[PDB]
Amino acid sequence: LIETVFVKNIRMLSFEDISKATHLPKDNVEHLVMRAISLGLLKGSIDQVNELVTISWVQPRIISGDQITKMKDRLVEWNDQVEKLGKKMEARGQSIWV
Amino acid sequence: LTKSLSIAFENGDYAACEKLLPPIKIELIKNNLLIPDLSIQNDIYLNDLMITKRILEVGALASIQTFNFDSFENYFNQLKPYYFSNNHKLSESDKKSKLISLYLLNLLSQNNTTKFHSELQYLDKHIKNLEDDSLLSYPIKLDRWLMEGSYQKAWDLLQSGSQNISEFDSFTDILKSAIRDEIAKNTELSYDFLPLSNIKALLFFNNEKETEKFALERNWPIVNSKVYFNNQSKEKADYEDEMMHEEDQKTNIIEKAMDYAISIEN
Burial (CB count <10 Å: 0-12, 13-18, 19+), residue A50:
exposed
Q: Which residues constitute the domain of residue B43?
A: 1-230
Largest CA distance in chain B: 80
Distance from CA of B257 to the nearest CA of A (A): 9
For chain A, how are helix, strand and coil distributed in percent, rounded to 5? Answer: 55, 15, 30
Q: Distance between CA atoms of B163 and B160, rounded to whole angstroms?
A: 6
Cβ-based burial of B152 (10 A; exposed 0-12, middle 13-18, buried ≥19):
exposed
In a domain, residue B93? The reply is: yes
d(CA B93, CA B51): 14
DSSP sequence for B78-93: HHHHHHHSSSSSS---
DSSP structural state of residue B132? -
Interface test with B, best of A84, A94, A96, A97 (most B CBs within 10 A): A96
Report the C-alpha gap between A20 and A30 in whole angstroms.
14
Give exposure, B37-60, as e/b (b: 16+ Cβ within 10 Å).
Answer: eeeebeeeeeebbebbbebbbbbb
Residue of A nearest to B259 (CA): A93
Is A92 within 8 Å of B258 when comparing Cβ atoms?
A: yes
Establish if B1 belongs to a structural domain. Answer: yes
**Domain-located, residue B252:** no
**Structural domains counted in chain B:** 1
Residue B135 within a domain = yes
**B257: nearest CA partner in chain A:** A93
Among candidates A1, A53, A3, which has minimal Cα distance to A22?
A1
How many angstroms separate the CA of residue B111 from the nearest CA in chain A?
43
CA atoms within 13 A on the CB side of B157: 20
Q: Where are the beta strands (DSSP E) in chain A?
A: 12-14, 42-47, 52-58
- Read off the amino acid at residue B103: Y
Q: CA-CA distances (angstroms) from residue B18 to A65, B33, B60, B63, B146?
A: 85, 24, 11, 8, 36
B chain contacts of residue A89, beta-carbon cutoff 8 Å:
254, 258
Q: What letters, b where the CB count within 10 A reaches 16 and e where it falls short, cover B156-193?
A: ebbeebeeeeeebebbbebbeebbbeeebeebeeeeee
Whether B196 is covered by a domain: the verdict is: yes
